[PDB]
Amino acid sequence: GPQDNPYERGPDPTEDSIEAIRGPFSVATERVSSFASGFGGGTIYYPRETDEGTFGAVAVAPGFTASQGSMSWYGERVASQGFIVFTIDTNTRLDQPGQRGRQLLAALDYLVERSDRKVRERLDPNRLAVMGHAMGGGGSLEATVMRPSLKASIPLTPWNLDKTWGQVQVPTFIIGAELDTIAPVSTHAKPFYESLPSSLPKAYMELDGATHFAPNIPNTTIAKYVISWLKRFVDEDTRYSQFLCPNPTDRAIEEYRSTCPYK
């Protein structure tokens, strides 16, 4: 209930609600020009209804050679659960993970400092998160080292040649694709996960049979746990702990690792 947490948004969740293509909030968009400073522009998805209060935000980066269109399905699927979701483009499609991390932070700065009134009035600037695919997932990790005040980080089939993330202090949920040949889980996702502190709230979800591009098309297993992670950590919403702990056992999941419970 709202009395025990001012950040709770939407009705009490069910497996149905977290798997839904659209959550309880209707969503509008604002397009941001690529000539915005610090990143390549993007699309801001935001909840229209303001009667429950302001929302946290997640900036969402694509991978190498890719654009925001590869991540577009996250926009309304996650925003309709009560989040501002900014699917960005990078300065160039060839940008590397550190560059992508800086651009994720620039996108969040844009929301806080430069966005239209419609967005700015709906945003709690104290509750921000990052998510990204592949090199953008590497970027999500990088952004958390740069800005430890982030509330959550979701590296999706992440790629990074930097394998060590022990200094990360932000709750991090890594999603791996079992059969990824571009960022193989053996040398990317798994070592990133194991390198994160064992006292950090964290999880690793590996998708059975999945390729590197699994995160680029609607995937209910990805969506329901992305939503739950952001709820738990951006909103401190413990109504969603039930889906994260104990570890999920969905058939689509090859394996799940976590530091449950998240005190």
Where does this chain bind Zn ion (CB under 5 A)?
Answer: 1, 4-5, 162, 164, 178, 208, 254
Residue list 116-155, contact with ligand 9J6 (CB under 6 A) = 134-135
Binding-site residues sit at 4, 8, 15, 34, 36, 39, 51-52, 76, 142, 162, 164, 178, 206, 208, 254-256
Q: Is the dihedral of CA 92, 95, 97, 101 positive or negative?
A: negative
Q: Are 196 and 259 in contact (CB under 8 A)?
A: no
1 binds, among ligand 9J6, Zn ion, none (CB under 5 to 8 A by kind): Zn ion
The smaller minimum CB distance to ligand 9J6, of residues 119 and 135, is found at 135
State the pairing for strand pair 42-47/27-32: antiparallel
> Residue 82: left if φ>0, alpha if ψ -120 to 50, beta else—which one?
left
One residue of 28, 112, 182, 252 binding ligand 9J6 per CB under 6 A = 182
255 binds, among Zn ion, ligand 9J6, none (CB under 5 to 8 A by kind): none
Does 55 sit near ligand 9J6 (CB under 6 A)?
no
Helix, strand or coil for residue 225? helix
d(CA 32, CA 111): 10
Does 189 sit near ligand 9J6 (CB under 6 A)?
no
Counting residues that bind ligand 9J6 (by CB under 6 A) gives 7
4 binds, among Zn ion, ligand 9J6, none (CB under 5 to 8 A by kind): Zn ion
Q: Is the peptide bond before 13 cis (omega within 30 degrees of 0)?
A: no
182 binds, among Zn ion, ligand 9J6, none (CB under 5 to 8 A by kind): ligand 9J6
In whole angstroms, how far apart are CA 36 and each of 75, 114, 217, 224? 19, 9, 27, 32
Q: Is the dihedral of CA 170, 126, 226, 181 positive or negative?
A: negative
Positions touching ligand 9J6 (CB under 6 A) are: 63-64, 134-135, 159, 182-183
